Symmetry: C3
Subunit: 127 residues, 3 copies
Amino acid sequence: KVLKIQLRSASATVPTKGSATAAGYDIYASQDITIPAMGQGMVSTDISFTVPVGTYGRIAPRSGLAVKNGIQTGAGVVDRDYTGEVKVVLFNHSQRDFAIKKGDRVAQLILEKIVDDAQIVVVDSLE
Amino acid sequence: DKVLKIQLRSASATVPTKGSATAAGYDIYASQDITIPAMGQGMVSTDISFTVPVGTYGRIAPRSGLAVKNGIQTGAGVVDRDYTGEVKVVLFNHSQRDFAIKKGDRVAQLILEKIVDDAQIVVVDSLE
Amino acid sequence: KVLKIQLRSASATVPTKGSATAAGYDIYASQDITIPAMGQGMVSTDISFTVPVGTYGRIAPRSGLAVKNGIQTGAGVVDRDYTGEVKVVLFNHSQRDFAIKKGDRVAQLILEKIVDDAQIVVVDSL
Ligand SMILES: O=c1ccn([C@H]2C[C@H](O)[C@@H](COP(=O)(O)NP(=O)(O)OP(=O)(O)O)O2)c(=O)[nH]1
Ligand SMILES: O=c1ccn([C@H]2C[C@H](O)[C@@H](COP(=O)(O)NP(=O)(O)OP(=O)(O)O)O2)c(=O)[nH]1
Ligand SMILES: O=c1ccn([C@H]2C[C@H](O)[C@@H](COP(=O)(O)NP(=O)(O)OP(=O)(O)O)O2)c(=O)[nH]1
Ligand SMILES: [Mg+2]
Ligand SMILES: [Mg+2]
Ligand SMILES: [Mg+2]
């Protein structure tokens, strides 16, 4: 059940649960960026991680940013074996640019359990 | 563990319904009329609170008909097991038509997603 | 755990992982379609599937199409008992039309584990 986190620069922040019982770990921007109104952006984190066996890491939205700033996460599927820098894709569905500073929390990581070793069987009909 | 506890906060709430014993999610119903403006967003009241099973969180996920026919996308959507407030549905309207919601309309579904909720974070110099 | 796939036409492609340890099975368009700028569309796949017991099929976005083309999946909850054709609903949040050709990978299927046998208990307080 280990979540291994690698901080790639001094600007990274270890992901943190917002509360003791939160489903997700908040993910912090490591560099300023603005997500334009009715536009999108890719936020740097300067982190890598290896999620637990049996999961993938889902980059999910924070509800406050959704309501107040019209922000939704895009993409969001991080494989357990990914060792590159994790990036957060954000869409801004509002009419106001959304300014992000280093150290702002921009999403939350959820360790989603999945079946990642299914046997695929082709059949004539599911019926 | 295999119990979903549901608190109704108003007479106009609806207990979420699966219907088919093998559907993924429980339908979530608006408890108050609301209009989601075109190219805009809104927060739908449900007048329910719930506690999902241990080892899950509640994901507010889209109904399929609304996405195609109305340009509606479900936003936010992560409900913690220990949340006791009113559950609200965040909807974005990416179409050019306002989307009218009436009390009793199905607006989303709740999926009890299994997660690792007790991981230990280990900070390492390299994942290699 | 078995993922059963029904191919409804010769234009369908059996879903494939992008690599041996990918989380998701890439889903292929079976017919050309254009997703309009700032609008949405529905991609045919000409497949049906029955996911493993204990899961549902989530139609999740690919990161490249998100960044490059402004594409987000919509809807995307495939119940284990759904036997119809699975279509991929795409939102295009960009101001550019997105053209899809038969055989393009347009989304990824994730076999998400869930509690699908909970019992509802109505209580006066949590
Ligand atoms: O779609 C949602 C999302 C969340 N909520 C509620 C339940 C959830 O547990 C709580 C917090 O969600 P987030 O962690 O996504 N919001 P945020 O990080 O902005 O605020 P918080 O400080 O509460 O964590 O808000 C909803 O009612 N509907
Ligand atoms: O939001 C994301 C999504 C993915 N990623 C990284 C990790 C993930 O494992 C990797 C691949 O994700 P996808 O399969 O969604 N992208 P795509 O299918 O476009 O590229 P690939 O050929 O690498 O599979 O990109 C992020 O950093 N942020
Ligand atoms: O992206 C999707 C979403 C759903 N579907 C299929 C599978 C799913 O199990 C079935 C029903 O989806 P919803 O609960 O999302 N749609 P809704 O509640 O509007 O209508 P229905 O009465 O058909 O369930 O539609 C797709 O093919 N693609
Ligand atoms: Mg939070
Ligand atoms: Mg439904
Ligand atoms: Mg991929």
